[PDB]
């Protein structure tokens, strides 16, 4: 029943070492979900991360210690009720926030159950979850990047040619006075 010192120390050390190397830690209220739901969510995560992401229920007193042993701050608010943790150790972390977001939606669960967490070392609130979940893909962002970098040149060319468009437009705004 009781654990040995050497057992209670490494359990904590393992969790702490993991948290020192995560690009994502998202705190969720998973109470009420079934073992089958846990299986399903884990299956979706594995589909994109292999063993690079995990989702599991962890005793609050354990989460509190591991988070402190690592060097997190302002996390105490995420541990007010029985909490499960979603974390990514390998791979880009945004896809996993997207996956648990959709999953909770697919189960008609209250999205506020998805409290914030930490994304690449930065704290994020429950209100920011959707924003992370709605981010476009890396490929899409790369495409968007091209236009944003070119904006100064596009803006110059549009501004100058606009001078000519002004004339074209005013003439139509008079012609169609029919």
């Amino acid at each position: 029943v009781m654990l040995t010192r050497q057992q209670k120390e490494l359990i904590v050390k393992e969790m702490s070492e993991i948290f020192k190397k995560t690009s994502l830690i998202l705190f969720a209220d998973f109470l009420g979900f079934t073992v089958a739901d846990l299986t399903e969510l884990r299956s979706r995560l594995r589909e994109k991360y292999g063993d690079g992401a995990r989702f599991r229920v962890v005793k609050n007193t354990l989460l509190n210690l591991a988070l402190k042993n690592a060097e997190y701050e302002g996390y105490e608010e995420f541990l007010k009720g029985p909490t499960a943790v979603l974390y990514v150790t390998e791979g880009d972390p945004v896809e996993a926030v997207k996956i648990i977001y959709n999953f909770y939606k697919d189960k008609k669960a209250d999205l506020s159950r998805l409290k914030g967490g930490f994304l690449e070392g930065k704290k994020f609130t429950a209100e920011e979850v959707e924003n992370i979940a709605k981010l476009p893909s890396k490929e899409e962002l790369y495409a968007m990047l091209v236009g944003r970098v070119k904006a100064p040149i596009t803006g110059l060319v549009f501004a100058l040619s606009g001078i000519l468009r002004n004339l074209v437009y005013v003439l139509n705004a008079i012609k169609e006075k029919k």
Binding site: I163, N166, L167, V170, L171, I174
Partner: peptide, 27 residues
Amino acid sequence: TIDEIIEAIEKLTVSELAELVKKLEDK
């Protein structure tokens, strides 16, 4: 005078073309 308008514009400076459109907007 339809192409005579075009040519009269062709020679217009950028600053003068602005004035023209400016006074055409005041309807």
